[PDB]
A = this chain, B = another copy of it.
Amino acid sequence: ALDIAIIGISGRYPQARNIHDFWKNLRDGKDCITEIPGGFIDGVDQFDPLFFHISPREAELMDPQERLFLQCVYETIEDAGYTRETLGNVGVYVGVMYEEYQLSPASIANRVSYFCNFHGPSMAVDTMCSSSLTGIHLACHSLQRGECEVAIAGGVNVSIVPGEGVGAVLLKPLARAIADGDHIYGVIKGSAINHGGKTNGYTVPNPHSQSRVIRRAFEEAGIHPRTVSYIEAHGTGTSLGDPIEIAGLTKTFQEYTKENQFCAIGSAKSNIGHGESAAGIAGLTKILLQMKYKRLVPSLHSRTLNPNIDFSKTPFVVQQELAEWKRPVIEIDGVTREYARIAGISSFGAGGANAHLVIEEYIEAEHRPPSSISSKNPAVIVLSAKNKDRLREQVQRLLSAIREQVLTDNDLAEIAYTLQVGREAMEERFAVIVKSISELEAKLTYYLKDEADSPDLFTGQVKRNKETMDVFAADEDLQQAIDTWITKGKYAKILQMWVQGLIFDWNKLYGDTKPRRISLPAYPFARERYWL
């Protein structure tokens, strides 16, 4: 069993600049196939090169995919609650076909590996659609072996029904993710890739090959296909070779059980079009969001089922309405048991490069933060950005996230922690000491209003203070002083100096059992255009 945990996602897909917006469009059932400004994405060229130490020229030269994927990978890293310097030996695998420019696509990954100091393997795989899913497969096995401690898989498609989109996933072994208290969107249990061979024509798919790849995947996963509850399909209902796909699945299902209409099935490419690589990463993201919010969403334009596909004789039901995704109870070989939310995804390349993944939801065995927050030991919320525009946007997005996500006094410890270690220290800095969620809400809204002076609200920069804050750390005696600051709990002085530049290991605050991380909003990248 692979047991590879997914601990971070980001992406930008049509009519959805962020992942939460993507869930909105999927759950509501929006058809995101807009007219040309095929489904397309907002801000193909938008980028914040000064953030990445990139000259505006180099930005204009960079293919939009390199830029967007770099931004999306930073977004995933921040979503997982890590920074570039806290991983590990990290692989970077990216699927892509279109890198059209004028006077290579490996840059897309290499740049990332270059910008994050990732010493693990960095490549871009191409297998047409499967380009995305194949990447994941490779990454996963590169982890199974030990080639890398962590990985980044993803896809990106920008065209100049087609469908644009970029997306990225961070991958880590399940063992050390449980151990390191990451938040786990799901677990990859099995993966498989293969090819059709000499079919009756080129670009024509071999159903026997699809059945074989899907069997091989579930076998690697040690998962009986009856336990399956959802299948992200490669194509939509009108796609010419969608019949073959269904048939193949059904064959490899009938080997293990002859039952019919028990597993849900859909495709996100009916909502945002066929993005090929973007489509693979988007299908994975749809499965993971379904698992998070415990709901099957509908695949659109599936109404009035095609006569070519009589699902009645297959174990697959087309999700037409939004419905609850319940953990199924099933009798199998005379064993009646409840099984977890399990899903499969298929991406078949036009050339014949088939790929299938098997995904199980994550369930914490035993773990809870006993709301340690109080006046004796409070929460220490800290944000930072490259300037004040972005710092204020960050405060805003944090407030809106605490609201739309509905966080509580129990998550304060975790919120604080994720913002402390899972955010990179920037030039413009803001911080508060808090006990309840309402206190933090009040202080953030206070900062937001134009006031030069605030109560117990620490602001600062690093532009000004360099040599003094520097000379601080360059001494053991003064370091002992900061350590005693922590022990005594003078958090207010610590913040008053941190806003000026002082750097200190947040882990020192609590000597044991650091809390879990959470999905917090990413750095609000400046949206400047570059296209030449």
Which of A's residues lie within 8 Å of B, judged by CB? 58, 92, 97-99, 104-107, 109-111, 113-128, 131, 134, 138, 141, 145, 193-199, 202, 209, 212, 349, 351-353
CA distance A122 to B111 in the complex (A): 25
Picked from B118, B127, B131, the residue with its CB within 8 Å of the CB of A195 is B118
Decide: A119 and B353 in contact? CB cutoff 8 A. no
CA distance A104 to B125 in the complex (A): 12
Closest to A122 in B: B195
Q: Which 9 A-B pairs have the closest CB atoms?
A: A110-B351, A117-B197, A124-B126, A122-B195, A113-B195, A117-B198, A97-B104, A106-B126, A121-B193
A66 CB to closest chain B CB (Å) equals 10
CA distance A133 to B136 in the complex (A): 20
CA distance A116 to B195 in the complex (A): 11
A133 CB to closest chain B CB (Å) equals 11
Picked from B98, B122, B199, the residue with its CB within 8 Å of the CB of A127 is B122
A-B contact pairs, 11 of them (CB 8 A): A104-B351, A106-B351, A107-B351, A110-B349, A113-B195, A113-B352, A113-B353, A119-B196, A120-B195, A121-B193, A123-B126
**Which residues of B have CB within 8 Å of A110?**
127-128, 195, 349, 351-353
**Which residues of B have CB within 8 Å of A92?**
195
**Which residues of B have CB within 8 Å of A99?**
98
**Which residues of B have CB within 8 Å of A138?**
138
Decide: B123 and A123 in contact? CB cutoff 8 A. no
Interface centre among A118, A127, A145 (most CB of B within 10 A): A127
Interface centre among A122, A123, A349 (most CB of B within 10 A): A123
CA distance A122 to B107 in the complex (A): 22
Closest to A123 in B: B127
